[PDB]
C-alpha cells in the first residue's frame, strides 16, 4: 500500500508549489511540442502522463471538484497528499487501515458541520458591480498575477452581471475572444460572439439574418474550359445566394473571383473560421454545417440578429449579438502581447466566472488565506481528545492535514512554514477566525482577511473537503495489483 501512497505523494508534490497567488508557474510541453508557462494546477495535471492507478483516483476526484465547483482543485490535491502522508505514518505506527478509514470519515463528518459556523456571507446581491466584483477578486488574484487583479476583476464582473435573471447562470454564456496586440489594460467588455473577417461589403442595420455554414473549406479549348469553370462557379454562388442569404462563412481563404461574385450579390465574404467556431455558432443560433455548395436550403439555416464591423481593439471584428434571448451571450475581448499569456488570462476569467456561478446558489463566504483551514484544524484537534478509542489518532491526523494548506501557501512564498504556522495558530486563539497569512511581507507576519477582503466560497470549500476525504479513503482501501 505504501507504493500507492508514495505515488500520490509525488503527484501532490509536483503541483504543491503552484498553490496560492505566488504559485511557481511551470513549463509545459505537450505531444505536439508547444511551450506553455502556466501556474494553473488543473492545466498541469492535464499534461501530466499519470499512469499509476492509485493517483488516477485523486486525479478523478480533482476533475469532479472542477466539474462541479470549478476551483479548489489544487486544494483537493494537496489535502489528499497530506491525508495520505499522515495515514501512512499511522499505518507505520501499527494501526489497521480500517481504523484509519473510520477516523477519517468521522473527522470529515465533524468538519462538514463545523464549517458553516464560520461564515461571513455576501453583502446584498450579485448586482452592484463594484461590490460583487470585490467579492470576485480573490480567485483571479490567486490564479494569475496579483498585480492586474484590480482590473481583471472589473472586466470579468461587468460581463457576468449583465444577465442576473431568475437566479440562473451558465458558464458557456460568458465567452472569451482573443485579440492580440496591445496590453491587458486595453481589454474591455463587449456583447455577442466575435471573430475576424476579410471582406468589407457588409451591411450594419440587419434584421434576422441568414447564416450559411461551410464545413468543407475552399488555345480555344483552354478558353472554353475557363468559361465552363467560371459559369459553374457563378451557378454555385447563385445557388448559395438564393433564399435571401446575406452572410456566408468558410474555413478557407479568400478568392478574388469568389469575393467578386459575393459582392455582386451585395454579400460579404467571411473567412478564417476556426476548428472550434462552427460548433459554437451552430449551438448559439441553431444552425447546421453544409458540406458542399449545391445543397443550400432555407430550413437547414440558422438565424442571427445584427452583424457589423467594430474597430474596437485597433482591428476589424465581426459581431453576432442579440440572440434569441437578446442578452444571453456576453463575450469578453482580451488584449495581450502574445497568445501564451492569453490562455492564462482566459483560465483566470473562467476560474472567476465559475466562482460567481457558485455564489449564485450560495451567498456564504468563508475567510480564505488559510484562516478557515487553521480554524478547522484547531476545532478538529480539540474534538479529538473528546473521542477516546482508536479513532483519535486518525482525527488528529485529519486536523494536521488541514494544517497543510497554509504551510504550502507560505513555503511557496519565501517564508518559513513552521514559523508562520505557529504564529497563525497562536494568534488564532485570541485573534480569532478572520486572521490568516499575509503575503506582502517577507517577514512571516499574519493579517486579517475580513478587513483585507480575501474570501472564498463556502460551497467550494465544503465540496473540496468532502471530495478529498473520499479520494483518500477510497485509495486507502486498495491492497495491490500486479504491475
Amino acid at each position: 500500500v505504501y507504493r500507492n501512497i508514495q505515488a500520490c505523494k509525488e503527484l501532490a508534490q509536483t503541483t504543491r508549489t503552484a498553490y496560492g497567488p505566488n504559485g511557481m508557474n511551470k513549463m509545459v510541453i505537450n505531444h505536439l511540442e508547444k511551450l506553455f508557462v502556466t501556474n494553473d494546477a488543473a492545466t498541469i495535471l492535464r499534461e501530466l502522463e499519470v499512469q499509476h492507478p492509485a493517483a488516477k483516483m485523486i486525479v478523478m476526484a480533482s476533475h469532479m471538484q472542477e466539474q462541479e465547483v470549478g476551483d479548489g482543485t489544487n486544494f483537493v490535491l494537496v489535502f489528499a497528499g497530506a491525508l495520505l502522508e499522515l495515514a501512512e505514518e499511522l499505518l507505520r505506527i501499527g494501526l489497521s487501515v480500517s481504523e484509519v478509514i473510520e477516523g477519517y470519515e468521522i473527522a470529515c463528518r465533524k468538519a462538514h458541520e463545523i464549517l458553516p459556523n464560520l461564515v461571513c456571507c455576501s453583502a446584498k446581491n450579485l448586482r452592484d458591480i463594484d461590490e460583487v466584483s470585490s467579492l470576485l477578486r480573490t480567485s483571479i488574484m490567486s490564479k494569475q498575477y496579483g498585480n492586474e487583479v484590480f482590473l481583471a476583476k472589473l472586466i470579468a464582473q461587468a460581463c457576468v452581471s449583465i444577465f442576473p435573471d431568475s437566479g440562473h447562470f451558465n458558464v458557456d454564456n460568458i465567452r472569451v475572444c482573443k485579440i492580440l496586440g496591445s496590453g491587458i489594460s486595453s481589454s474591455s467588455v463587449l456583447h455577442g460572439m466575435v471573430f475576424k473577417k476579410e471582406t468589407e461589403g457588409d451591411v450594419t442595420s440587419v434584421k434576422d439574418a441568414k447564416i450559411a455554414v461551410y464545413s468543407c473549406p475552399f488555345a480555344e479549348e483552354l478558353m472554353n474550359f475557363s468559361k465552363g469553370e467560371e459559369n459553374l462557379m457563378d451557378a454555385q454562388v447563385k445557388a448559395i445566394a438564393d433564399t435571401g442569404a446575406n452572410v456566408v462563412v468558410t474555413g478557407g481563404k479568400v478568392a478574388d473571383m469568389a469575393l467578386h461574385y459575393a459582392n455582386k450579390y451585395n454579400i460579404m465574404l467571411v473567412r478564417l473560421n476556426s476548428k472550434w467556431d462552427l460548433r459554437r455558432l451552430c449551438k448559439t443560433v441553431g444552425a447546421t454545417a453544409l458540406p458542399r455548395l449545391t445543397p443550400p436550403v432555407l430550413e437547414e439555416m440558422g438565424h442571427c440578429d445584427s452583424v457589423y464591423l467594430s474597430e474596437v481593439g485597433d482591428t476589424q471584428v465581426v459581431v453576432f449579438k442579440h440572440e434569441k434571448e437578446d442578452g444571453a451571450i456576453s463575450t469578453i475581448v482580451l488584449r495581450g502581447s502574445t497568445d501564451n499569456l492569453m490562455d492564462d488570462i482566459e483560465r483566470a476569467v473562467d476560474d472567476g466566472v465559475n466562482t460567481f456561478k457558485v455564489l449564485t446558489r450560495d451567498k456564504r463566504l468563508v475567510p480564505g488565506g488559510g484562516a478557515t483551514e487553521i480554524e478547522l484544524a484547531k476545532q478538529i484537534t480539540s474534538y479529538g481528545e473528546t473521542c477516546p478509542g482508536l479513532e483519535q489518532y486518525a482525527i488528529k491526523k485529519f486536523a494536521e492535514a488541514f494544517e497543510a494548506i497554509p504551510r504550502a501557501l507560505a513555503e511557496n512564498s519565501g517564508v518559513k512554514a513552521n514559523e508562520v504556522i505557529s504564529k497563525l495558530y497562536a494568534v488564532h486563539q485570541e485573534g480569532n477566525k478572520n486572521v490568516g497569512l499575509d503575503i506582502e511581507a517577507e517577514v512571516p507576519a499574519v493579517k486579517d482577511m475580513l478587513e483585507a477582503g480575501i474570501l472564498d466560497t463556502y460551497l467550494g470549500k465544503y465540496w473540496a473537503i468532502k471530495l478529498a476525504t473520499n479520494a483518500a479513503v477510497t485509495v486507502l482501501r486498495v491492497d495491490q495489483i500486479i504491475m
Partner: protein, 485 residues
C-alpha cells in the same frame, strides 16, 4: 555535511538503543552473543550486552560510557537511560529535517526536562524513614524481581541495619553518604545465617606472632608509611613515637619478633601486608593521623580511635576485630554462604536499597513504576504545552510523546498488543485526574500501581531522566566528528 553529522550521530544512537530495548522489565527477552570462536552466551542484562559488543562510532562509545557512569554511580536503570536517550534522539529527526536549528531543539529539550523534574517531584508518593514497614514494602517492590526472593528475609534486615553505618554529618542532617567505606566481609563456608553486622573495621591481616599486647582499651591509632628495621645501628622512629605515648601505631611493612619486642617496649601494635582500601577505612573509622616529618611532629600526631580491640581466629585464619570505633562511618558487615555467585548480587542490590534510603533521607519519595510515572509526566507535559506558544512547542510535545517508550516496551515484551493497551492507558490517565495507573509487567494488563505494589526511588528516576536529556543535548551539540577518520 551540516545536519548530516547530526543525523548520523542520532542514527548510531537509535541503532544502539534498540539492541537492548527488549531486555527490560520482569519479562526481559534473552540475547545471543557470537564471539569469533564459536561460543554462545545467554544474556538478560543489557549492561553486559553493551560491554561485550564492539562499536566504531564515537557517539555510540560516548553513550555507552555515560550508561556505565550512571551504572556505578546510582545503580540500576542503565537500560532505561539508553532507551530514553535513543527515543529522544530519534524523535529529534523530524525537526532536524525541518531545516530548523538544533539550538532551539536544545532549548525545548531543556525546558521539557525542567518540567519533567517538577512533575516527578509533584507526583511522588512519600515514604517514611527509619520505619521497617514501607522499607520492606520497597524491598517487595524493587529489591524483588531479582535473585533475592529466596534470601530476602536476610537481605532486608541486613540493609535495614546497614543504613546507619556510613553517615557523614558535614553540612546538614545525615545527607552525605560514601559508598566503599562499608567494611564488606564476603567469606564462603558455613550457613548463610552466620552473616551479621558489627560497628567497626574488620581487617583480614594480623601479626605473625601475637605474643604481645595487641588489644588496648583505648586504641589511639597512628598511621605511618615508614618501614620498621632492626634498630638505629630504626628505633629512633619508635623513640619519637614514645614522645606522644600511643598504644597502637599502624604501618604497612613486616614486623619481626625482635621488632615486635622493640614495639611492645613502646606498647604499640603494628600491622603488615594491609591494603590501602583497608587503611583508608581504618583512618576514617578511627580519625587518626599520619606524619613523620620531625618539624611537623606535634601533639596532633596521635588521634584516639576505637575503644576496644579483639582478635579471633575463626577457622584457623587471622582475623582482626576493631570494634567501638570513634567514627561509626566505616563499620563491619559480614557475609557467609557457599558460593559468591548470588551473594554479590544480593549485596549490590542491598547497597542499591542503601542509596534508596539515603535519598529518602533527602527526598523520601517514590514514583509509581510499570510505566505509571512515564505516562503521568507525558500527560503533564502535553497539557502544559497547550498554554505555551512559539516554534519550540513541537519539540516540547515530542519529548513527552517519546518518553512513553517504557510502558510501550513493557507491554511489547509481554504478548499483549502495544497499541490498544497504550491508548487505554492514556485514556484512563488524562480524564482520570488522581489515579496515575500503570501496566502490569507480568500479565500485560492495566492495573493501578497503588494496588499492585510496585514503586521506584525518586532519585534514580530523576538521575535517569536527567542523564537521558543531557545525552540527547550532547549528541545534538556535536557539529563535527572529523579529527581524522
Amino acid at each position: 555535511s551540516g545536519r548530516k553529522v547530526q543525523s548520523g550521530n542520532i542514527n548510531a544512537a537509535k541503532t544502539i538503543a534498540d539492541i537492548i530495548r527488549t531486555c527490560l522489565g520482569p519479562k526481559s527477552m534473552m540475547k545471543m552473543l557470537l564471539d569469533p570462536m564459536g561460543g554462545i552466551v545467554m544474556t538478560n542484562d543489557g549492561n553486559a550486552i553493551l560491554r561485550e559488543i564492539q562499536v566504531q562510532h564515537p557517539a555510540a562509545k560516548s553513550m555507552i560510557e555515560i550508561s556505565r557512569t550512571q551504572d556505578e554511580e546510582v545503580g540500576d536503570g542503565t537500560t532505561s537511560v539508553i532507551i530514553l536517550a535513543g527515543e529522544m534522539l530519534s524523535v529529534a529527526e523530524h525537526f532536524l529535517e525541518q531545516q530548523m536549528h538544533p539550538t532551539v531543539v536544545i532549548s525545548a529539550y531543556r525546558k521539557a526536562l525542567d518540567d519533567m523534574i517538577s512533575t516527578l517531584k509533584k507526583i511522588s508518593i512519600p515514604v517514611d524513614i527509619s520505619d521497617s514497614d514501607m522499607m520492606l514494602n520497597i524491598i517487595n517492590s524493587s529489591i524483588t524481581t531479582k535473585a533475592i526472593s529466596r534470601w530476602s528475609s536476610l537481605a532486608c534486615n541486613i540493609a535495614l541495619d546497614a543504613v546507619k553505618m556510613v553517615q557523614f554529618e558535614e553540612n546538614g542532617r545525615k545527607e552525605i553518604d560514601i559508598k566503599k567505606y562499608a567494611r564488606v566481609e564476603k567469606i564462603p563456608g558455613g550457613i548463610i545465617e552466620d552473616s551479621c553486622v558489627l560497628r567497626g573495621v574488620m581487617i583480614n591481616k594480623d601479626v605473625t606472632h601475637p605474643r604481645m599486647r595487641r588489644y588496648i582499651k583505648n586504641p589511639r591509632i597512628v598511621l605511618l608509611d615508614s618501614s620498621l628495621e632492626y634498630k638505629k645501628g630504626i628505633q629512633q622512629l619508635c623513640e619519637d613515637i614514645i614522645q606522644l605515648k600511643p598504644d597502637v601505631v599502624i604501618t604497612e611493612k613486616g614486623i619481626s619478633d625482635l621488632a615486635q619486642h622493640y614495639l611492645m617496649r613502646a606498647n604499640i601494635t603494628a600491622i603488615r601486608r594491609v591494603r590501602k582500601t583497608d587503611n583508608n577505612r581504618i583512618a576514617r573509622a578511627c580519625g587518626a593521623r599520619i606524619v613523620s616529618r620531625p618539624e611537623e611532629l606535634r601533639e596532633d600526631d596521635v588521634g584516639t580511635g576505637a575503644g576496644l580491640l579483639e582478635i579471633k581466629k575463626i577457622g584457623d585464619e587471622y582475623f582482626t576485630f576493631i570494634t567501638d570505633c570513634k567514627d561509626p562511618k566505616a563499620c563491619t558487615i559480614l557475609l557467609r554462604g557457599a558460593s559468591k555467585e548470588i551473594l554479590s548480587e544480593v549485596e549490590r542490590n542491598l547497597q542499591d536499597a542503601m542509596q534508596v534510603c539515603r535519598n529518602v533521607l533527602l527526598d523520601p519519595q517514590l514514583v509509581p513504576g510499570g510505566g505509571a510515572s512515564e505516562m503521568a509526566v507525558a500527560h503533564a507535559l502535553t497539557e502544559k504545552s497547550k498554554a505555551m506558544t512559539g516554534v519550540e512547542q513541537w519539540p516540547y510535545r515530542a519529548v513527552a510523546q517519546a518518553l512513553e517508550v517504557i510502558p510501550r516496551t513493557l507491554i511489547q515484551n509481554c504478548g499483549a498488543s502495544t497499541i490498544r493497551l497504550l491508548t487505554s492507558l492514556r485514556a484512563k490517565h488524562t480524564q482520570e485526574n488522581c489515579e496515575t495507573w500503570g501496566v502490569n509487567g507480568e500479565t500485560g494488563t492495566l492495573v493501578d500501581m497503588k494496588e499492585l505494589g510496585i514503586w521506584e526511588p525518586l532519585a534514580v528516576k530523576l538521575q535517569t531522566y536527567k542523564t537521558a536529556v543531557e545525552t540527547a543535548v550532547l549528541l545534538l551539540r556535536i557539529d563535527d566528528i572529523v579529527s581524522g577518520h
